[PDB]
Amino acid sequence: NLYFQGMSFKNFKCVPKMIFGRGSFVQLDTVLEQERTDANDFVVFLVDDVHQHKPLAARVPNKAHDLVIYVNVDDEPTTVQVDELTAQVKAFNTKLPVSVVGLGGGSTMDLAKAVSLMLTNPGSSSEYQGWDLIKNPAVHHIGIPTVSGTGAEASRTAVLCGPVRKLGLNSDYTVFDQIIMDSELIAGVPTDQWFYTGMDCFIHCVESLQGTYLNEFAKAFAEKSMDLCREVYLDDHPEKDDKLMMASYMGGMSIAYSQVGACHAVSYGLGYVLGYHHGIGNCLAFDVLEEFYPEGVAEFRKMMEIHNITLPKNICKDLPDETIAKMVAVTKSMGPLWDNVYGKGWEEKVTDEMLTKLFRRI
Amino acid sequence: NLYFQGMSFKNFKCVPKMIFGRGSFVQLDTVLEQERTDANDFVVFLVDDVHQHKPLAARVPNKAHDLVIYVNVDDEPTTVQVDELTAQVKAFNTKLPVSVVGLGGGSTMDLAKAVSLMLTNPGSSSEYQGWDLIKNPAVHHIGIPTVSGTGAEASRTAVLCGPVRKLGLNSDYTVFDQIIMDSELIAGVPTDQWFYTGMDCFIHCVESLQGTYLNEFAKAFAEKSMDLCREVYLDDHPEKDDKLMMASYMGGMSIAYSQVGACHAVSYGLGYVLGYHHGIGNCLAFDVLEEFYPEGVAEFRKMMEIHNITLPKNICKDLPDETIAKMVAVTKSMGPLWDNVYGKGWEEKVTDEMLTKLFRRI
Ligand SMILES: NC(=O)c1ccc[n+]([C@@H]2O[C@H](COP(=O)([O-])OP(=O)(O)OC[C@H]3O[C@@H](n4cnc5c(N)ncnc54)[C@H](O)[C@@H]3O)[C@@H](O)[C@H]2O)c1
Ligand SMILES: NC(=O)c1ccc[n+]([C@@H]2O[C@H](COP(=O)([O-])OP(=O)(O)OC[C@H]3O[C@@H](n4cnc5c(N)ncnc54)[C@H](O)[C@@H]3O)[C@@H](O)[C@H]2O)c1
Ligand SMILES: [Ca+2]
Ligand SMILES: [Ca+2]
Ligand SMILES: [Ca+2]
Ligand SMILES: [Ca+2]
Ligand SMILES: [Cl-]
Ligand SMILES: [Cl-]
Ligand SMILES: [Cl-]
Ligand SMILES: [Cl-]
Ligand SMILES: [Cl-]
Ligand SMILES: [Cl-]
Ligand SMILES: [Cl-]
Ligand SMILES: [Cl-]
Ligand SMILES: [Fe+3]
Ligand SMILES: [Fe+3]
């Protein structure tokens, strides 16, 4: 009773080293130099290929023996892609790299987390989708966001589309060893993507604050994160880039000690079955969940108006029942998320009938 | 210019593992068990002796071969005390312990940090007062607050009164490997101590937010910390114990990426020379620094009224000039703090004349 409650609290592993500041990408070489202990040590840089022909590519401090892979996140990470990148690293050099760097958004960061894991753990990444399935430590890995809002930089998961579902590699080993938060690097994100990924953060906060998993640690982080989001998207603050990077991080810290909810549940269906990306998919879901998060949706609708956002509509209106069934099956399987939303007895409330009504309104 | 600014940002090492929740002290045994790799491994528990005859002593999970030291913080930590505790550990067992636990307030936590360091670094702790002087990693160490507000649980320093001054062992190695934040443990702190240590947190926030070292990372933490303090001390919130623990932590994270200021500067003089403890000494200083922090002092004066706090007065009114000179010398030597307050050209503003006027009003 009293003992069992005390033992229940999560021992949260967070990112132990962080650099925050505009221009701080310049420190990556010095950071990596502390990991290079031999002449023949190498680093893997996984760089979102949006950067491949941009000035940021030329700033990547790769040595002649390092491996730079410009990764394609036009579709979100899959277990097939993680396995293919991991095979690439092994074919390039059988020696473990001394670090794996993820330079990009949530997709690229999650690829770097997953590759850093699959280098020291056998089999397909599909065998590790779930909770605490990883038994060997990852290779040292570094997260450098070039889009802000997912909180992927701060979290203990790496979300992948596998054979059966979208589900993350949840493990203390997944957590980045180092992150660099340089808001100069988010400069050229298109406005709509900036908005959608930023709303991922906003929606994290709302779902955490409504949920049954909440404690004061998650609550302090989620409230300040949500306030920073307001400064970014409502107040048009001049330091909105640094502010959005802090919101993202604090939002990740929040979820890490709580849980996401109904909007993420639904979004994962749209994402797995129809291929909608996470930022926009969350927003699509959120716009039909006003009964769940009345104030959040109202505020988000106001943010959309300011930023000229028109969500695509009638995505699911004329789709076959078979395709809707697949989305409902994926969303229903997210137990912890619906537990957060509803509490004990959530199985009886989250029916196929109700989820189907939601998806048909998207 | 642009490169030198990018390189200037601190690579912040924070506490990598945290448990937050009421009753979570019960997990300490399981946590320590992960560090015990032999039958003959031992742990040092440094326990604030306020707990020695209280029920919390009986909950400490010491094995027969472990060392429990009930430490006396009636005076704040000195280099002599750190050296004496370190000698005690070495005389008890020449083998390094697998962890050093600090169960107490800021004083006890700083003792545990310092001992964990001096076990692997030669000489007196006085030789390490300063910045980045520690060259060998500390023994694994765990922080468990039983008074909330210093932020000692989150910081990279351990503040000691040495031969010459109050100055900390500032180093990435100083940082706790693990903290447990169980607000049941702060239950029996007397009201005035609860207020004074809590105002340490409040004052951290104010000094950080006024300063020239501020960035958005320190700013987000300090603002939310300050809001939590208001919930605790103005709103009388029912979850004030968990809230104050979060404020303390977030306040420590803030200072860690910024700096304290004029109030801490002055407080360190009162502390070193006259022996005033840190919480009450800060409040004494703050009450004469209204020109520096007008809004902070006003709000703190209001908090004092609610909590029936009457600061002792005329402490310095009738003291010899020689004794005031000593306090001014210590306060003036805090360069980074006055740099935070004033910026470049602080040496010309922080004169003996001005500091002497302040101290005479305390
Ligand atoms: N690991 C976690 O804890 C966690 C949490 C939430 C979401 N996620 C995952 O994050 C992924 C989405 O990440 P995201 O929303 O950051 O988007 P993303 O990484 O998928 O990138 C979105 C688009 O922005 C582009 N882009 C990135 N940086 C840019 C730059 N500076 N300039 C111009 N364009 C740039 C990319 O090339 C891409 O086309 C999803 O797969 C989602 O599941 C992970
Ligand atoms: N390391 C850092 O980053 C940092 C930052 C700020 C201050 N400090 C240091 O922290 C020290 C002050 O710490 P503090 O303000 O927490 O006070 P403290 O640790 O000195 O303890 C204050 C008093 O409270 C008592 N106490 C502790 N727990 C109690 C409990 N649960 N019930 C009843 N009484 C209890 C103690 O026995 C003591 O008498 C100073 O030496 C200061 O320099 C360190
Ligand atoms: Ca390509
Ligand atoms: Ca593309
Ligand atoms: Ca004693
Ligand atoms: Ca005593
Ligand atoms: Cl790829
Ligand atoms: Cl996941
Ligand atoms: Cl655009
Ligand atoms: Cl809401
Ligand atoms: Cl002692
Ligand atoms: Cl110090
Ligand atoms: Cl009392
Ligand atoms: Cl002020
Ligand atoms: Fe998300
Ligand atoms: Fe302090």
Q: Domain of A123: which CATH number? A: 3.40.50.1970
- The residue whose two tokens read 């840190």 is B278
Q: Which two tokens stand for residue B16?
A: 């990598």
Give the integer Cα–Cα distance in Å for B81 and B89: 12
Give the integer Cα–Cα distance in Å for A130 and A147: 26
> Is A6 close to B14, i.e. CB distance below 8 A?
no
Give the integer Cα–Cα distance in Å for B104 and A215: 23
Give the integer Cα–Cα distance in Å for A240 and A232: 5
Same domain, B99 and B207: no
Q: Which ligand is nearest to the CA of B52?
A: 5
Give the integer Cα–Cα distance in Å for A4 and B28: 14
Give the integer Cα–Cα distance in Å for A189 and B319: 63
Same domain, B171 and B215: no
Our count of domains for chain A comes to: 2
> Is B243 close to A215, i.e. CB distance below 8 A?
no
Write out the DSSP string of A155-213.
-S--EEE-SS-EEEEESGGGS-SEEEE-GGGGTT--HHHHHHHHHHHHHHHHHHHHSTT
Which residues, including other chains, have CB under 8 Å from residue B293's CB and lie 6 or more apart?
Answer: B206, B207, B210, B262, B263, B286
A12 in contact with chain B, both atoms CB, cutoff 8 A: yes
- Asked if A174 contacts A117 with a C-beta cutoff of 8 angstroms, the reply is yes
- Asked if A288 contacts A158 with a C-beta cutoff of 8 angstroms, the reply is no
Across the strands, what pairs with B166?
Answer: B161
> Is B20 close to A243, i.e. CB distance below 8 A?
no
Give the integer Cα–Cα distance in Å for A224 and A256: 15
Among B3, B10, B243, the residue with its CB nearest the CB of A216 is B243
Give the integer Cα–Cα distance in Å for A112 and A106: 10
Q: Which two tokens stand for residue A174?
A: 């997944």
Q: Which residues of A touch B17 (CB under 8 A)?
A: 11-14
Distance between start and end Cα atoms, chain A: 43
For residue B292, the number of C-alpha atoms closer than 13 Å in the C-beta half-sphere is: 28
Same domain, A107 and A185: yes
Q: Which two tokens stand for residue B319?
A: 């003291």
- CB-ligand 1 contact for A193 (6 Å cutoff): yes
Per DSSP, B271 falls in state I
Give the integer Cα–Cα distance in Å for B154 and B113: 11
3-state secondary structure of B171: coil
Which residues, including other chains, have CB under 8 Å from residue B356's CB and lie 6 or more apart?
Answer: B324, B328
- Strand (E) or helix (H) holding A226: helix A216-233
Which residues, including other chains, have CB under 8 Å from residue B81's CB and lie 6 or more apart?
Answer: B71, B111
Among B3, B20, B31, the residue with its CB nearest the CB of A215 is B20
| Atom in ligand 1 nearest the alpha carbon of residue A154 | 3
Annotated binding site of B: 48, 74, 106-107, 110, 146, 155, 157, 166, 185, 197, 200, 204, 264, 278
Give the integer Cα–Cα distance in Å for B217 and B205: 13
Q: Name the residue in chain B with its Cα closest to that of A14.
A: B16
Give the other-Cβ count within 10 Å of B131's Cβ.
14
A-B CB pairs within 8 A amount to: 123
Q: Which residues of A touch B26 (CB under 8 A)?
A: 3, 6-7
**Ligand 8 center to B92 CA (angstroms):** 47
Across A268-295, b (16+ Cβ under 10 Å) vs e yields bbbbbbbebbbbbbbbbbbbbbeebbee
Among residues A287, A335, A296, the alpha carbon closest in space to that of A201 is found at A296
Same domain, B37 and B174: yes
Which residues, including other chains, have CB under 8 Å from residue A211's CB and lie 6 or more apart?
Answer: A258, A259, A261, A340, A341
For residue B98, the number of C-alpha atoms closer than 13 Å in the C-beta half-sphere is: 17
Per DSSP, A79 falls in state H
Give the integer Cα–Cα distance in Å for B36 and B25: 18
B13 in contact with chain A, both atoms CB, cutoff 8 A: yes
Same domain, B153 and B214: no
| Atom in ligand 1 nearest the alpha carbon of residue A49 | 37
Across A307-343, b (16+ Cβ under 10 Å) vs e yields bebeeeeebbeebeeeebebbbbbbbbbeebbbbbbe
Ligand 2 shell residues, CB under 6 Å:
B 48, 50, 73, 76-77, 104-108, 110, 146-147, 150-152, 155, 157-159, 185-186, 188-189, 193, 197, 200, 277-279
Give the integer Cα–Cα distance in Å for A137 and A146: 26
Q: Where are the beta strands (DSSP E) in A41-104?
A: 43-48, 67-71, 99-104
Per DSSP, A306 falls in state H
Task: Tell me the shortest Cα–Cα distance from B343 to chain A, in angstroms.
Answer: 19
Q: Name residue B99's amino acid.
A: S
Domain boundary among B138, B172, B190: B190
Q: What angle do CA A15, A35, A102 make, to 5 degrees?
A: 50
Same domain, B290 and B344: yes
Q: Which two tokens stand for residue B312?
A: 């002792």
* A177 marked as part of a ligand binding site: no
Query: What's the order of all strands across the beta sheet hosting B130-131?
Result: B130-131, B166-170, B159-161
Which residues, including other chains, have CB under 8 Å from residue A86's CB and lie 6 or more apart?
Answer: A114, A115, A118, A119, A125
Q: Which two tokens stand for residue B326?
A: 């000593």
Among residues A216, A116, A124, A212, the alpha carbon closest in space to that of A171 is found at A116
| Atom in ligand 1 nearest the alpha carbon of residue A159 | 43
Residues in chain B, how many?
362
Give the integer Cα–Cα distance in Å for B270 and B287: 14
User: How far, in Å, are A234, B78, B79 from residue B138 at the CA level?
Assistant: 46, 19, 17
User: How far, in Å, are A361, B80, B312, B322, B329 from residue B270 at the CA level?
Assistant: 67, 20, 13, 14, 11
Residues in chain A, how many?
362
Q: What angle do CA A8, A9, A12 make, to 5 degrees?
A: 140
Q: Name the residue in chain A with its Cα closest to that of B2.
A: A23
Give the other-Cβ count within 10 Å of B76's Cβ.
21
Give the integer Cα–Cα distance in Å for A109 and A175: 11
Q: Where are the beta strands (DSSP E) in B72-202?
A: 99-104, 130-131, 141-145, 159-161, 166-170, 178-181
> Is A31 close to B14, i.e. CB distance below 8 A?
no
Strands B166-170 and B159-161 come out as antiparallel
Task: Tell me the shortest Cα–Cα distance from B29 to chain A, in angstroms.
Answer: 11
Give the integer Cα–Cα distance in Å for A204 and A207: 5
- Asked if B184 contacts B145 with a C-beta cutoff of 8 angstroms, the reply is no
**CATH code, domain carrying A280:** 1.20.1090.10
3-state secondary structure of A105: coil
SS (H, E, C) A238-295: CCHHHHHHHHHHHHHHHHHCCCCCHHHHHHHHHHHHHCCCHHHHHHHHHCCCCCCCHH
Method: X-ray
> Is A13 close to B14, i.e. CB distance below 8 A?
no
Same domain, A173 and A270: no
Nearest Cα residue to atom 30 of ligand 2: B189
Q: Which residues of B touch A17 (CB under 8 A)?
A: 11-14
Query: What's the order of all strands across the beta sheet hosting B17-20?
Result: A11-13, B17-20, B178-181, B141-145, B99-104, B43-48, B67-71
3-state secondary structure of B69: strand
Select from B13, B20, B177 the residue whose CB has the most chain A CBs within 10 Å, as the one to mutate to test that interface.
B20
Q: Which two tokens stand for residue B188?
A: 């029996």
**Ligand 16 center to B264 CA (angstroms):** 7
Give the integer Cα–Cα distance in Å for A88 and A81: 10
Q: What's the sign of the alpha-carbon dihedral B203, B205, B209, B215?
A: positive
Q: Name the residue in chain A with its Cα closest to that of B28.
A: A7
Which residues, including other chains, have CB under 8 Å from residue B227's CB and lie 6 or more apart?
Answer: none
- Asked if A116 contacts A161 with a C-beta cutoff of 8 angstroms, the reply is no
Interface of B with A in 15-34 (CB under 8 A): 15-27, 30-31
Q: Which residues of A touch B241 (CB under 8 A)?
A: none
Among residues B205, B216, B251, B157, the alpha carbon closest in space to that of A18 is found at B216
- Asked if B141 contacts B112 with a C-beta cutoff of 8 angstroms, the reply is yes
3-state secondary structure of B269: helix
Same domain, A54 and A6: yes
Which residues, including other chains, have CB under 8 Å from residue B30's CB and lie 6 or more apart?
Answer: A7
Same domain, A149 and A211: no
Write out the DSSP string of B278-345.
HHHHHHHHHTT-TTTSHHHHHHHHHHHHHTT------SSTT--HHHHHHHHHHHHT-HHHHHHHH-TT
User: How far, in Å, are A218, A258, B248 from residue B243 at the CA level?
Assistant: 11, 16, 9
Select from B4, B11, B177, B183 the residue whose CB has the most chain A CBs within 10 Å, as the one to mutate to test that interface.
B11
Domain limits at B334? Answer: 191-362
Among A3, A8, A20, the residue with its CB nearest the CB of B9 is A20
Q: Name residue A169's amino acid.
A: L
CA A123 and chain centroid, separation: 23
Nearest Cα residue to atom 36 of ligand 1: A50
Among B31, B215, B228, the residue with its CB nearest the CB of A20 is B215
- Asked if A10 contacts A76 with a C-beta cutoff of 8 angstroms, the reply is no
Q: Name the residue in chain A with its Cα closest to that of B17.
A: A13
Among B16, B25, B31, the residue with its CB nearest the CB of A16 is B16
- Asked if B183 contacts B144 with a C-beta cutoff of 8 angstroms, the reply is no
3-state secondary structure of A96: coil
Give the integer Cα–Cα distance in Å for A266 and A289: 10
Nearest Cα residue to atom 42 of ligand 1: A278
Q: Name residue B66's amino acid.
A: D
Q: Which two tokens stand for residue A108?
A: 């690229």
Same domain, A168 and A146: yes
Across A164-194, b (16+ Cβ under 10 Å) vs e yields ebbbbbbbbbbbbbbbbbbbbbbeebeeebb
- The residue whose two tokens read 């009421």 is B22
Q: Which two tokens stand for residue A240?
A: 């909105």
The C-alpha torsion from A222 through A226 and A227 to A233, rounded to 10°, is 160
Across the strands, what pairs with B141?
Answer: B100
Domain boundary among B190, B215, B240: B190
Among B10, B24, B224, the residue with its CB nearest the CB of A220 is B224
SS (H, E, C) B3-55: HHHHCCCCEEECCCEEEECCCHHHHHHHHHHCCCCCCCCCEEEEEEHHHCCCH
Q: Which ligand is nearest to the CA of B268?
A: 2
Same domain, A166 and A200: no
Give the integer Cα–Cα distance in Å for B225 and B248: 7
- Strand (E) or helix (H) holding B113: helix B106-118
Nearest Cα residue to atom 6 of ligand 1: A150
- CB-ligand 1 contact for A105 (6 Å cutoff): yes
Backbone angles phi, psi at B328, to 5 degrees: -60, -40
3-state secondary structure of B221: helix
Task: Tell me the shortest Cα–Cα distance from B15 to chain A, in angstroms.
Answer: 6
Domain boundary among A190, A214, A237: A190
Same domain, B264 and B325: yes
Helix axes A278-286, A191-210, angle to 10 degrees: 60
> Is B21 close to A11, i.e. CB distance below 8 A?
no
- CB-ligand 1 contact for A254 (6 Å cutoff): no
- Asked if A301 contacts A362 with a C-beta cutoff of 8 angstroms, the reply is no
Give the integer Cα–Cα distance in Å for B340 and A178: 27
